[PDB]
Amino acid sequence: MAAQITDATFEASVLKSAIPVLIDFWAPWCGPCRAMGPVIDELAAEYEGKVLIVKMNVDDNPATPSKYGIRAIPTLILFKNGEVVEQVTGAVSKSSIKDMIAQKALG
């Protein structure tokens, strides 16, 4: 499952792990950002037990996007071992995110 996590909390679960992880950056003041709610919740259950999934709020955690090279936008990052390999900027459908992770994160 996915949830709303915090900069000091997510690293203790993701960055300390060897599993592939997915971040989604969002804020409640933008439309496609808050509308990712049912998107993340579908795909989070497609990858369960073999992939880690979190969403990161850019109004509550303004340093977390900035250190991954982001401002305050709907963008997702796919990586492993706590170290970036690929990002996806702009909003995308749950169907497109699954069809991508089917090789990227599941291997």
CATH code of the domain covering residue 76: 3.40.30.10
| Total structural domains within the chain | 1
How was this structure determined? It was done by NMR
Catalytic residue among 7, 17, 30, 41: 30
- The answer to whether 63 and 25 are in contact (CB under 8 A) is no
Shortest CA distance to 91 belongs to which of 71, 68, 64, 73?
73
Q: Which residues pair with 21 in a beta bridge?
A: 52, 79
What number of residues does the chain have?
A: 107
Which residues contact residue 74 at a Cβ distance below 8 angstroms, ignoring those fewer than 6 apart?
24, 25, 26, 30, 32, 33, 36, 90, 91
Sign of CA dihedral 67, 54, 50, 36: negative
Question: Which residue segment(s) compose the domain that 80 sits in?
Answer: 3-105
Catalytic residue among 21, 27, 33, 51: 33
- Mark whether 30 is an active-site residue: yes
Report CA-CA distances (Å) from 99 to 6, 36, 38, 74, 107: 28, 16, 17, 19, 12
**For the chain, counts of helices (H) and of strands (E):** 5, 5
